[PDB]
């Protein structure tokens, strides 16, 4: 089958662990509601098998910095 992550427009998506999520929240001094949101019906979310309440680490292909890290919180539809 055609994986959703093989597209050039789709960056790598990885589910953060609990300790990784806590460290990310501590680093930026933000709550879980101050992160960008991603819908639970997103193709990347259903491909990763994530559930609402998790934080997805996105490895963007930066035109300026080469590789850039973005974080999105899974929320219900």
């Amino acid at each position: 089958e055609f994986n959703i992550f093989d597209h050039v427009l789709v960056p790598e998506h990885r589910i953060l662990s609990e300790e990784e999520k806590e460290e990310l929240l501590k680093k930026y001094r933000i709550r879980i509601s101050q992160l960008p949101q991603i819908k639970a019906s997103d193709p990347a979310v259903v491909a990763l098998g994530a559930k609402p309440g998790d934080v997805i680490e996105i490895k963007r292909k930066s035109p300026t910095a080469g590789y850039y890290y973005y974080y999105r919180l899974v929320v219900e539809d």
């Binding site: 597209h7 789709v10 960008p36 963007r60 300026t64 080469g66 999105r72």
Partner: protein, 378 residues
Amino acid sequence: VAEKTIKSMVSKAELPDNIKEELYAKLIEYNEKYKLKKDEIQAIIDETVREYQKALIEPGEAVGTVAAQSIGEPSTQMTLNINVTLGLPRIIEIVDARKNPSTPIMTVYLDEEHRYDRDKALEVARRIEGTTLENLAREETIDILNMEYVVEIDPERLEKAGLDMEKVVRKLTGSFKSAEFEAEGYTLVVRPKKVTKLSDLRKIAEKVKKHRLKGLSGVGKTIIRKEGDEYVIYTEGSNFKQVLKVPGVDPTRTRTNNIWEIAEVLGIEAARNAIIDEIVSTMREQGLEVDVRHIMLVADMMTLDGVIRPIGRHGIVGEKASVLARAAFEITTQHLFAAAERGEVDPLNGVVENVLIGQPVPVGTGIVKLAMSLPLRP
């Protein structure tokens, strides 16, 4: 100086990873040409670090306002008006998050089995392209003696469509069960089963001619172009989900003009990337140089909540937490009354509300805090 020493110095230097690789490659290229010494390499690395530190943006900069100005100013010299209609209408449609863009265009790529020869590309295109009965027919004539509509088609368009006559009559007979279809020569003859009223003939004649014989819905025109010793298929209309699962089509590089289809099929991050690419392509076509950082900031603000949002009263401004900022932009009475109903509280953390009241804005010098020891003497 060996390459290992240069790599070690580059790694020891404080630089981003993308800068480190480019600097190492340039130093390797220049090392054989001019026989660089260790002190020269160290000075080059120090200068690169200093330039990187100098290029860092200072805190407190109004990046959003600068981005909005740097996007809106080149639009004042844009040009208005195959069938791609770029320019100011295109960027307006992009920033307004239009559900259905005007003249959608789908860029379709092919795998290794079809990207080398024109015949495979042509048959893939004819598989993608949607052909119905009304375009195949030469003229329309309602016949009353048989009490049913009669269809005739030219041989050239039937041959180029890729399906023969038997395929056509099997397509309509399976799809439509109210009336039967008979064919002789190069003509279609339709015969009713329980149709007697003349008014019921028109409702069944139009349904027959608009039925799609083959291809994907929403695609009516398809062209093929060659670039970089590869064949790229450009279609009119957008059906991303259907065209993704089509044999002979590479789904890794296939993209569409509709950002909403990209979000629904690929993801929100892919939608943001598509928005950035569309804005960059429009600016490049118009001949206007705009820094990509403004475009990525706009796209990040557009896809903050996981869905594509416009920049108007129904998008980013509509979901602003400030009552005064929302009321000041487009809709004043409705927003104020809605805030009065809910008892909303405006924390005055934004810029517009502080401008309205007469308080310093939280940008530039407004975020600077000062302290001073009192026992100060000359």
